[PDB]
């Protein structure tokens, strides 16, 4: 029903397939995107992304990532997506120290210290994200890279502040208001599109990915907040407190798929 899995160890990514057979599929995510192989679509339109987040929006340390449960209405359309998609949550992937590789996707082999993902469902076709997941319905995902910067990105302040409040597995916190738009790259023009999967079990191959080409800046000081996060792991009859680090899935084969590039 929901098998144990981790980002390393006996239940690490190489082994997910043993309990979650779809992680062995041929339409898996994430991937390295080679620009020269991507083919050349309505314009990407965001709706609601500039509105201030409400005080009900909250952040949770899930043990696998830090998640932001969105409580406002944010919608995306265009970019080949079938209809309108509404945002459900945001999740993060990071390395270990010093801006080490933390992204899931890469572009021309280039990885990034963080990857932020936003997950969407079609609110018209389905009444909730969880049902969509259930029916293996199509869901939308944006991948945004963060890139090292000499000074703090103020736009990230509320998120970094929130991280400080959820150091341990299961902690939750409300966040200071933030502008979802400002966690996306300054230029939305260049992005890639392909069909792939969840990058965690059950690895369902239902994801329309929007991978933005240009990164969002983050300082080494801000990154420290990600590296300061902990999780817990299980061994036979033991639970342990562990650093939450390098929480990314290794990359997967393209196979029959092509990447589109705006």
């Amino acid at each position: 029903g929901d098998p144990y899995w981790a980002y390393s160890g006996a239940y690490g990514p190489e082994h997910w397939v043993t309990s979650s057979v779809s992680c062995g599929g041929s339409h898996q995510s994430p991937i390295d995107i080679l620009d020269h192989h991507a083919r050349v679509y309505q314009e990407l339109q965001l709706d609601g992304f500039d509105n201030e987040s409400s005080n009900k929006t909250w952040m949770k340390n899930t043990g696998k990532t830090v998640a932001i449960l969105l409580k406002d209405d944010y919608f995306v359309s265009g970019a080949g997506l079938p209809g309108r998609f509404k945002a459900e949550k945001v999740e993060f992937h990071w390395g270990h120290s010093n801006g080490s590789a933390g992204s899931e996707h890469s572009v021309n082999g280039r990885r990034f210290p963080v990857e932020m993902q936003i997950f969407f469902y079609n609110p018209d076709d389905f009444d909730s994200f969880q049902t969509a997941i259930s029916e293996n319905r199509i869901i939308g995902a944006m991948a945004i890279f963060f890139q090292v910067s000499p000074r703090d990105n103020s736009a990230l302040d509320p998120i970094i502040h929130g991280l400080k409040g959820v150091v341990h597995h299961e902690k939750e916190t409300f966040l200071d208001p933030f502008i979802l738009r400002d966690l996306l790259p300054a230029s939305l023009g260049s992005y890639y599109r392909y069909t792939g999967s969840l990058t965690t079990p059950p690895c369902s191959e239902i994801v329309e990915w929007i991978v933005f080409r240009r990164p969002v800046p983050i300082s080494y000081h801000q990154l420290e907040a990600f590296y300061s996060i902990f999780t817990t792991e299980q061994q036979d009859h033991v639970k342990s407190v562990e650093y939450l680090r390098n929480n990314f899935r290794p990359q997967q084969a393209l196979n029959d798929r092509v990447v589109s590039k705006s």
């Binding site: 341990h168 036979d236 407190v241």
Partner: protein, 376 residues
């Protein structure tokens, strides 16, 4: 000339599953003239008699948790009317052995916080817990704590001396039976030492704690952390915790014996170290099952007289009342005024003769008092 009177009303029965008696008894001895007939209920359905019934008492040969465990009640009837018994639970108390006889070796890093999981076997009855470390009781202190709710062993910060074998010892408090689990061998993983970090409260009491009058209520709180956290208990409202309360040596359990109203309210546990603080909070809400203060007694009255009958119970929340006549709910109607724990009959007639029961109840329990109205 009398309606049924309980001589031996069903009481809770604890049967030890690994007993030697192939039989359990549920009492329902009743006296009336004429002699009453008796029926049994289980989980609200009738017991259609390997069941036996002797002098009203239900005898079960070959008791079996699956078919027999549950809530019983008897109902006694003669020509003068009917009464219903209190409910009684038949409970099979047991504790199985641990199934798997084998633990994987586990490795933890010096400085790391961890929990050794008991994983107690199927059982019925309250359990208590202890661990054995390298063949000697595992010493508890600010750094090592055993939960009596989970039975887990919490180690705030692992040190080199912790290497060795750990077995969980589980005791059924009802049968006094003890079982040992397979040892889990634990070793140091020789990567670093763990860095420092905020306490993580790893076991704690619920946000809402029903706290029964007269009982001892136990609250747990323990955190993993480097440096080892301190654990502090307080009441949110600043009042001192009662001196009768006991603290476990690791400070991981606060026990409040003989619980009384003044002991209720919001409690906090603060876990702190040089890296930060976290708090568990919860409200203890006092309650008490109903207790009889005034019962109804038999009434002998003549035609056309009137009748006022009252029962009274204490409890928290304050009990409400309802009435039965011959086992059926009795509500206000012609001549008969039913108001909470009172029954007022203006002008008695022959049809009023019967058995009556005044019932007092709250969220936490229901109690019955029974008497006969007889007319002349």
């Amino acid at each position: 000339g009398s309606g049924p009177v309980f001589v031996q009303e069903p009481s809770h029965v604890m049967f030890p599953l690994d007993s030697e008696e192939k039989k359990v008894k549920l009492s329902c001895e009743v006296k009336g003239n004429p002699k009453p007939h008796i029926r049994w209920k289980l989980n609200g359905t009738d017991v259609d008699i390997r069941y036996s019934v002797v002098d009203g008492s239900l005898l079960i040969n070959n008791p079996n948790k699956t078919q027999d465990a549950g809530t019983y009640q008897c109902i006694a009837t003669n020509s003068f009317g009917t009464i219903v018994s209190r409910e009684a639970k038949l409970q099979f108390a047991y504790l199985e052995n641990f199934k798997t006889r084998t633990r994987s070796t586990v490795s933890v890093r010096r400085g790391q916080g961890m929990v050794l999981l008991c994983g107690p076997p199927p059982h019925s009855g309250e359990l208590s817990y202890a661990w054995i470390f390298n063949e000697y009781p595992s010493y508890q202190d600010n750094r090592r704590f055993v939960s009596q709710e989970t039975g887990n062993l919490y180690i705030a910060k692992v040190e080199k001396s912790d290497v060795g074998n750990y077995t969980c010892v589980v005791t059924n408090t009802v049968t006094n039976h003890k079982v040992l689990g397979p040892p889990t061998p634990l070793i140091l993983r020789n990567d670093g030492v763990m860095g420092e970090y905020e306490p993580k409260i790893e076991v704690q009491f619920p946000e809402t704690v029903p706290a029964e009058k007269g009982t001892t209520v136990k609250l747990e709180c323990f955190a993993l952390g480097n440096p080892v956290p301190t654990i502090l208990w307080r009441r949110a409202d600043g009042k001192p915790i009662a001196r009768k309360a006991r603290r476990h040596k690791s400070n991981g359990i606060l026990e409040i014996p003989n619980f009384q109203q003044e002991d209720a309210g919001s409690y906090e546990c603060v876990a702190e170290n040089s890296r930060g603080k976290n708090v568990a909070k919860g409200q203890l809400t006092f309650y008490a099952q109903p207790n009889w203060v005034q019962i109804i007694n038999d009434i002998h009255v003549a035609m056309e007289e009137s009748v006022f009958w009252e029962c009274k119970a204490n409890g928290r929340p304050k009990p409400t009342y309802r009435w039965l006549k011959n086992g059926d709910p009795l509500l206000t109607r012609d001549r008969i005024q039913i108001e909470q724990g009172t029954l007022n009959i203006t002008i008695v007639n022959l049809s009023d003769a019967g058995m009556y029961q005044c019932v007092a109840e709250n969220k936490h329990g229901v109690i019955f008092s029974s008497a006969e109205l007889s007319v002349i």
